[PDB]
Amino acid sequence: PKALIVYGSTTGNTEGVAEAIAKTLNSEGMETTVVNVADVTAPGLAEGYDVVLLGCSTWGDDEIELQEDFVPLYEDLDRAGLKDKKVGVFGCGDSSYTYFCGAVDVIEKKAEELGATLVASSLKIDGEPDSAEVLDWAREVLARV
Amino acid sequence: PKALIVYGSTTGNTEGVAEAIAKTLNSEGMETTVVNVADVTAPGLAEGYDVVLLGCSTWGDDEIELQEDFVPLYEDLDRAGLKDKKVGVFGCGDSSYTYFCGAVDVIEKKAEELGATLVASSLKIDGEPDSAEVLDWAREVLARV
Ligand SMILES: Cc1cc2nc3c(=O)[nH]c(=O)nc-3n(C[C@H](O)[C@H](O)[C@H](O)COP(=O)(O)O)c2cc1C
Numbered sequence: 001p002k003a004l005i006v007y008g009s010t011t012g013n014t015e016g017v018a019e020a021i022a023k024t025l026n027s028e029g030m031e032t033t034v035v036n037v038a039d040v041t042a043p044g045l046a047e048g049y050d051v052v053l054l055g056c057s058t059w060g061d062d063e064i065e066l067q068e069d070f071v072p073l074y075e076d077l078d079r080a081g082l083k084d085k086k087v088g089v090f091g092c093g094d095s096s097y098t099y100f101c102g103a104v105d106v107i108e109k110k111a112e113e114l115g116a117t118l119v120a121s122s123l124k125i126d127g128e129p130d131s132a133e134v135l136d137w138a139r140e141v142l143a144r145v
Numbered sequence: 146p147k148a149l150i151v152y153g154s155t156t157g158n159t160e161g162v163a164e165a166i167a168k169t170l171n172s173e174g175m176e177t178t179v180v181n182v183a184d185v186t187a188p189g190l191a192e193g194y195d196v197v198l199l200g201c202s203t204w205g206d207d208e209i210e211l212q213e214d215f216v217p218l219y220e221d222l223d224r225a226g227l228k229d230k231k232v233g234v235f236g237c238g239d240s241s242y243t244y245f246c247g248a249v250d251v252i253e254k255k256a257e258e259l260g261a262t263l264v265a266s267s268l269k270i271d272g273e274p275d276s277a278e279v280l281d282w283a284r285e286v287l288a289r290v
């Protein structure tokens with residue numbers, strides 16, 4: 001099977017989680033392409049992948065701001081081919097702020113409204129990722145695809 | 146059975162939806178308590194209710210914000226006794242915005258992480274509330290009590 005990981009990341013945190021997910025998936029025979037969301041467009045993006053993992057950090061002062069590179073994909077996510085596609089959502093944040101990983105909830109709800117199959121409960125990284133939590137999430141995705 | 150309807154509303158729209166839902170529930174034999182979230186504190190809020198309906202509009206000048214009175218309830222929602230509780234989420238918004246009722250997305254996701262049972266898909270109200278849409282949702286809730 002093939003996986004796509006698309007991430008929005010300002011300081012590299014969510015990018016590092018994407019890369020760590022991909023290293024496991026690739027090691028377990030699921031060919032995985034990791035791309036900055038800034039470099040993709042929505043139409044047909046999920047077609048041809050058996051699973052798509054969406055990563056996005058949360059920013060904004062006293063608000064949920066999606067990491068800015070992700071917003072155009074969120075706006076047009078209805079064109080990506082997610083109906084009955086396996087999806088998982090992840091992202092970095094920090095529980096000292098108001099809406100801890102709120103972008104992850106916003107993106108996961110839209111995926112669900114668009115008919116995606118959510119492979120696992122979302123991965124919400126508080127601060128610096130722990131390799132155990134990232135690895136177990138990658139194993140859920142593998143088990144479900 | 147007893148229903149709690151807790152709402153955050155700045156211009157009265159989600160308040161008016163709360164009242165319309167309550168009319169339905171009360172006409173179908175529930176004892177409904179309606180409260181503005183500005184007047185409550187989180188600890189133990191849900192205790193003794195058969196179903197809890199959480200209503201909140203979407204604000205924020207630039208991005209997603211919960212209606213301001215709801216924010217402290219959301220932040221301390223873990224104290225509200227939602228584990229194994231039947232919950233429904235509703236809210237007003239405007240689909241001209243990027244994040245249409247994004248406060249509903251965020252509250253719904255948190256309620257499920259806290260172990261609540263969602264009794265119905267969440268109700269997202271676009272602009273002026275439609276009485277048929279509200280009534281259909283209230284009847285979905287009543288059938289799960
Ligand atoms: C001004 C500002 C606002 C933030 N707001 C949030 C927030 O609302 N929720 C959250 O969980 N984390 C919040 N964060 C934490 C960032 O998501 C966190 O630093 C994350 O590691 C960034 O990931 P990235 O490098 O992939 O962009 C905020 C950080 C800053 C500096």
Ligand SMILES: Cc1cc2nc3c(=O)[nH]c(=O)nc-3n(C[C@H](O)[C@H](O)[C@H](O)COP(=O)(O)O)c2cc1C
Binds near residue numbers: 158
């Ligand atoms: C400044 C401002 C920001 C808003 N932002 C959003 C938004 O991000 N998403 C949305 O769906 N609706 C948004 N709305 C629409 C309000 O949610 C809508 O007017 C609603 O009826 C208010 O309900 P309330 O009277 O219960 O507070 C915004 C409205 C205003 C005035």
